[PDB]
């Protein structure tokens, strides 16, 4: 399958959890995170960072008795992947294409929502600098 679509497959998603700290004895294992749609996106700063592949919600701060599904419902109730009940292979191509369109939309929405935030931050700085000149300063 093309790389673009691999995140739709659980075994791919599991394979992302390279150094996941929570393992057996825990509620949020790699298996269970992946069943819930998450992938592992670690960084230097947020080493337990995980992201829904579908709605792109990013969650860190994971505790061991967290149920990844219950967490995904709480933090991103809108996510259509939570509605999906059939296994990947039991999907029709129509249904699958419908979903991938919804994912592309979510992705765009997220990128858009970031740009707005960066911009609003930049505007704040510019405004401030101008206010400071107007102070006679």
């Amino acid at each position: 399958l093309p790389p673009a679509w691999q995140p739709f497959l659980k075994d791919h998603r599991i394979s992302t959890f390279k150094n996941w700290p929570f393992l057996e004895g825990c509620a949020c294992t790699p298996e269970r995170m992946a069943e819930a749609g998450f992938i592992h996106c670690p960084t230097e700063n947020e080493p337990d960072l995980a992201q829904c592949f579908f709605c792109f919600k990013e969650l860190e701060g994971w505790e061991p008795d967290d149920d990844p599904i219950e967490e995904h419902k709480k933090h991103s109730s809108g996510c259509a992947f939570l509605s999906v009940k059939k296994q990947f292979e039991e999907l029709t191509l129509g249904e699958f294409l419908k979903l991938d369109r919804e994912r592309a939309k979510n992705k765009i929405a997220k990128e858009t929502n970031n740009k707005k935030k960066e911009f609003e931050e930049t505007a704040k700085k510019v405004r401030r600098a101008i206010e400071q000149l107007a102070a006679m300063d």
Partner: peptide
Amino acid sequence: ARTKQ
């Protein structure tokens, strides 16, 4: 667990 920042 909690959102990014």
